[PDB]
Paper text:
The sequence with the lowest energy score was termed “Mitsuba-1”. This 143 residue sequence includes 6 residues of the Threefoil linker, shows 61% identity with MytiLec-1, and retains the HxDxH and HPxGG motifs crucially involved in binding galactose. Analytical ultracentrifugation (AUC) shows that Mitsuba-1 is a monomer in solution, with no indication of larger species or aggregation, a result confirmed by size-exclusion column chromatography. The structure is well ordered with each subdomain forming a β-sheet of four strands. Overlaying 143 Cα atoms of Mitsuba-1 and MytiLec-1 gives an RMSD value of 0.86 Å, showing the structures are highly related. The three-fold symmetry prevents internal residues of Mitsuba-1 from approaching the symmetry axis too closely, and a central cavity is found in the structure with a volume close to 100 Å3 according to KVFinder25. Three GalNAc ligands are found at shallow binding sites related by the three-fold symmetry of the protein.
The polypeptide chain has three well-conserved repeats of a roughly 50-residue sequence, and adopts a β-trefoil fold. Here we have adopted a similar procedure and applied it to MytiLec-1, to create a related protein with three identical subdomains, that retains sugar binding activity and the ability to bind selected cell types.
Numbering used by the authors: -1 to 143
Amino acid sequence: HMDGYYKIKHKASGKFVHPKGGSSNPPNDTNLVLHSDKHERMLFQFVDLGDGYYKIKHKASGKFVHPKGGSSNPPNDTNLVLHSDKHERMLFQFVDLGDGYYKIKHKASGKFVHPKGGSSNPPNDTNLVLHSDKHERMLFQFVDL
Ligand SMILES: CC(=O)N[C@@H]1[C@@H](O)[C@@H](O)[C@@H](CO)O[C@@H]1O
Ligand SMILES: CC(=O)N[C@@H]1[C@@H](O)[C@@H](O)[C@@H](CO)O[C@@H]1O
Ligand SMILES: CC(=O)N[C@@H]1[C@@H](O)[C@@H](O)[C@@H](CO)O[C@@H]1O
């Protein structure tokens, strides 16, 4: 129930969400990407604000998941980045399909987190984006540490 530290795992590929470059201290607007590796710089915390909306926090840096530019309605294929700012456009909802695999939905726009290109096997360092489509390659699993 979303307390503690988690790996965010892409169902189709098994890859994880990382800051690009994997650093403990990425600057603002660093891209989020998928990558196979596991380490403490790919852990996240979920901060429950109530009523099923969450801030997604990078453990190592304390920065949050944003759409690049922070719009209420980002276009399809808008990059997800880390940023220290907080506001309504960096909130997310987790929708369970019913077996513990989730769509990760941007509250403001209703778009979902996808690997860019939607592959079942994104290459390492593929950017994560927002997109309106739903399919099995935009499901994620939250793996507690
Ligand atoms: C050696 C090392 O930490 N490598 C990291 C890797 O684990 C992953 O975090 C990646 C994400 O872009 O960034 C680097 O290549
Ligand atoms: C929209 C705005 O006024 N500021 C935001 C900032 O808060 C953050 O969301 C960032 C993410 O790239 O995009 C803009 O710079
Ligand atoms: C046709 C096809 O592959 N569509 C996908 C789409 O569903 C979405 O996953 C997107 C994310 O960048 O990548 C592709 O455009």
